[PDB]
């Protein structure tokens, strides 16, 4: 049963959100997620990359903040300001995966820190990705908060920036409802895509609010 969802990041409510803590995604993600790199202050969600704890398997600690609940077709909106640095990604995306008994379906707004005048849109449907599209913003997303969105329908996904649609994709669209997830992370083995990360300290992607409306 999907219903309006609104989140202002005023307070952490463990029934609604989950601070990812003590696992990483592996592969190209060169960090473990730490609940301590999530901060809610003055109504802004701050997700940071820092140096990880001494006994971590990775050099860096990221943050990922994720809804308890899952969401279906409709309009997903974020008001956010990604981080700028080579070799990192600041994200708003939906995700479900084999662990939850479904195919890996996911829809992505990724800000490649190497160049925050661009956004990357992408989606995975039954694990099949390779739908990358880089949209030129003609502003620097790292300097101010802006509103990014996708409207996910059975037959397409539309992405939008500051209220206007800028890209639509038709091919093999995701099916299974997913959690909303926000993250920031440094990459490894992907110098071509992200640039090399340079260990620059205390990068923060900030998020003013998120909304979902079943339409
Ligand atoms: Ca807010």
TrEMBL record:
GO biological process, one term: carbohydrate metabolic process
Alphabetical list of InterPro entries matching this protein: Beta-glucanase-like (IPR000757), Beta-glucanase/XTH (IPR044791), Beta_glucanase (IPR008264), ConA-like_dom_sf (IPR013320), GH16_AS (IPR008263)
GO molecular function: hydrolase activity, hydrolyzing O-glycosyl compounds; metal ion binding
Protein's UniProt keywords contain Metal-binding: yes
Binding site for Ca(2+): 8, 43, 208
Record's keyword terms, sorted: Calcium, Glycosidase, Hydrolase, Metal-binding
Domain named GH16: residues: 1-215
Active site: 106, 110
Record's keyword annotation contains Metal-binding: yes
Similarity-based family: Belongs to the glycosyl hydrolase 16 family.
Name of this protein: Beta-glucanase
Organism of this sequence: uncultured murine large bowel bacterium BAC 14
Lineage: Bacteria, environmental samples
Gene name per UniProt: bgl14A1
């Amino acid at each position: 049963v999907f219903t309006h969802f609104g989140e202002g990041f005023d307070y952490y409510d463990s029934q609604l959100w989950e601070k990812a803590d003590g696992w990483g995604n592996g592969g190209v993600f060169n960090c473990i997620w730490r609940a301590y790199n999530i901060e809610l202050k003055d109504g802004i969600l701050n997700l940071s990359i820092t140096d990880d704890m001494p006994s971590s398997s990775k050099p860096y600690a990221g943050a990922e903040y994720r809804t308890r609940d899952k969401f279906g077709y409709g309009l997903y909106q974020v008001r956010m300001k990604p981080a700028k640095n080579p070799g990192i990604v600041s994200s708003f995306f939906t995700y479900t995966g084999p662990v939850h008994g479904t195919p890996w379906d996911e829809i992505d707004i990724e800000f490649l820190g190497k160049d925050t005048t661009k956004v990357q849109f992408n989606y995975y449907t039954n694990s099949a990705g390779n739908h990358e599209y880089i949209y030129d913003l003609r502003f620097d997303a790292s300097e101010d908060f802006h509103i990014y969105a996708f409207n996910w329908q059975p037959n397409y996904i539309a992405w939008l920036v500051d209220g206007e649609e800028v890209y639509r994709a038709y091919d093999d669209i995701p099916v299974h409802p997913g959690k909303i997830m926000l993250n920031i992370w440094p990459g490894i083995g992907v110098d071509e895509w992200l640039g090399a990360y340079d260990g620059k300290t205390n990068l923060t992607a900030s998020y003013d609010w998120v909304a979902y409306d079943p339409i």
